[PDB]
Amino acid sequence: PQITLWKRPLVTIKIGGQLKEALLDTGADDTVIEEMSLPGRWKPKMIGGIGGFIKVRQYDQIIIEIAGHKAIGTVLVGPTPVNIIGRNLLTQIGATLNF
Amino acid sequence: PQITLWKRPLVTIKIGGQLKEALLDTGADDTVIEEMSLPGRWKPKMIGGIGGFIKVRQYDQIIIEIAGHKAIGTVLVGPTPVNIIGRNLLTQIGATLNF
Ligand SMILES: COc1ccc(S(=O)(=O)N(CC(C)C)C[C@@H](O)[C@H](C[C@]23C[C@H]4C[C@H](C[C@H](C4)C2)C3)NC(=O)O[C@H]2CO[C@H]3OCC[C@H]32)cc1
Ligand SMILES: [Cl-]
Numbered sequence: 001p002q003i004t005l006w007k008r009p010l011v012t013i014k015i016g017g018q019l020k021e022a023l024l025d026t027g028a029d030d031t032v033i034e035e036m037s038l039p040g041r042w043k044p045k046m047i048g049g050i051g052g053f054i055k056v057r058q059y060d061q062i063i064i065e066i067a068g069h070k071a072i073g074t075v076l077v078g079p080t081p082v083n084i085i086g087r088n089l090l091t092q093i094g095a096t097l098n099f
Numbered sequence: 100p101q102i103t104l105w106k107r108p109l110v111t112i113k114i115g116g117q118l119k120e121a122l123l124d125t126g127a128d129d130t131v132i133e134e135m136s137l138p139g140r141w142k143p144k145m146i147g148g149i150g151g152f153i154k155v156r157q158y159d160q161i162i163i164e165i166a167g168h169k170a171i172g173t174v175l176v177g178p179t180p181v182n183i184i185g186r187n188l189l190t191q192i193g194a195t196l197n198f
């Protein structure tokens with residue numbers, strides 16, 4: 001699809017068996033999902049943006065479905081009010097910025 | 100241009116006669132730049148990032164070139180980890196997300 005930026009670029013994703021809405025975010029290096037359980041081992045990480053840093057759990061090799069396209073990669077889980085699909089998974093679905 | 104997301108989508112901007120590097124950020128509603136001097140009056144704005152809320156200076160109707168495309172719009176000045184070009188100016192340069 002071609003997604004305009006007049007509004008936030010929100011799509012439906014499926015992760016951990018759950019359907020969620022998420023933001024396609026080219027400024028996020030990594031994908032960050034609101035608090036949820038995922039299977040497998042994890043390790044702590046700090047990520048920073050406007051306002052400073054938050055602590056998240058890093059899960060590797062997690063599959064997501066993003067607007068109908070399957071991808072696999074690292075997912076960070078932590079206290080965010082909005083699910084963020086970051087570059088590590090945007091690349092896998094062939095997303096590009098065009099102008 | 101068509102910009103893939105394997106690396107950060109960094110571009111050169113021109114604002115205040117000066118060249119700076121900025122990140123094209125579809126998850127930002129607003130454009131936020133690090134401390135610099137801009138002409139005219141400013142207004143207060145609170146914006147919320149991943150780490151919490153910060154006060155910024157809002158300057159309206161600022162001329163800015165982004166990857167060679169001309170925009171005239173609102174620029175927020177404050178402590179950001181990187182200069183970010185948000186949707187208010189991405190729309191002016193005709194950017195879309197495609198996959
Ligand atoms: C290492 O991997 C990551 C490291 C950092 C982030 S980040 O969420 O902090 N951020 C990085 C960027 C600031 C360099 C991504 C941004 O797109 C962030 C994305 C957010 C995702 C989620 C919803 C909302 C607030 C917050 C939580 C940040 C936008 N947007 C943002 O801060 O926008 C501000 C400027 O415009 C305004 O409009 C939106 C908030 C404000 C994500 C993954
Ligand atoms: Cl990854």
Ligand SMILES: [Cl-]
Pocket residue numbers: 094103
């Ligand atoms: Cl590619």
Ligand code: NA
Pocket residue numbers: 039040041059060061062
């Ligand atoms: Na894992």
